Each structure stands twice: as C-alpha cells, then as structure tokens.
Design a protein around this ligand. Sequence first.
Ligand SMILES: CC(=O)N1[C@@H]2CC[C@H]1c1cccnc1C2
Length: 165
Amino acid sequence: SFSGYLKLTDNVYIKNADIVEEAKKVKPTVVVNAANVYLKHGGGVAGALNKATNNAMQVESDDYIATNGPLKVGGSCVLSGHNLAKHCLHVVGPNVNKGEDIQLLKSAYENFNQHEVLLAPLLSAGIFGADPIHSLRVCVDTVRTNVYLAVFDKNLYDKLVSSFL
Ligand SMILES: CC(=O)N1[C@@H]2CC[C@H]1c1cccnc1C2
C-alpha cells in the first residue's frame, strides 16, 4: 500500500519521493513512465526508471518500437514493469522543449483512466518543459482513477501543495 501521501482530491494523492525508490518499495501494479514517442529512455524519469531495470526496459522498448513504430504524443503503451512494478504504462506527454501542443497533456493523462491505480510522475514536467503546476491541475481534472504522484524535488512539491486549489 502507498504510504505518506497527501490527499489532494477524492482520487489524487501526492508525495515528495523518488519514483524509482517508491516503485521498488510499493511494487505497484502500474508505474507510469514519462516516455517519448521513441521510447528512448535517456534522462529524467525515463532514464532513471530504465537505469533501475538495468536497461531491460530499454531492450523491451526497442523491440516494441521495431514492431509497432513510435507512439503518438498523448498516447501510451503498456509494457513490463520489470523489477519496479507489474506493468509500466509509458505515457507521452507533450514536450514543450520540442514545441509540442500543451493541449495534448489532457490526452496524455486520459491514458491513466484505463488503470484503477497508478504510481506516476507529473506528465510533461521536468525535462519535458511544462509548468508542473499546470500538469497537476490537468491531472486532477482528467484522471478519475487513483493516482499516486511522486514529485522528487522538495521545493517543487511544496509549491505544488501550497498553490493547490
Ligand atoms: C532525482 C530526480 O530528480 N528524479 C528521480 C527520477 C526523475 C526525477 C524524479 C521526478 C519525479 C519523481 N521522482 C523522481 C526521482
């Protein structure tokens, strides 16, 4: 069971935590990856999750792309969670540093509704360049299933909580 989360709404919870450490402790049914369309898990959340799998996530992902081609921005795929979770839901939020449409963030969060409970980061935050405050608002207004958000940066976590409405 998830522990130490602050309840923001009926279905959204948040914690200042490293999502890799959280996944290793909880072993959730679903961990969300902040993926790109190519499933190239180089940095940010994706790089960290992939490193924690000893690159097994990347190997699996490369086979997935070779068979299926790239994901769409706003889309997702379900792959193995390896040693971190039962499944990994790879979700592609828009990357503002690539000029992608921030309106696709809502479509990205809609993928979460296909899973009753998820451990997730804020989509499009961090190296994806979107405002994490906006990402949290889109999350709360889009996701209806139970989502446990892990925010690594304590300063950002405090800002997210203190500005939540
Ligand atoms: C150390 C650090 O900044 N991070 C790790 C992996 C990506 C980033 C991060 C973001 C959100 C939740 N957990 C985490 C934990």
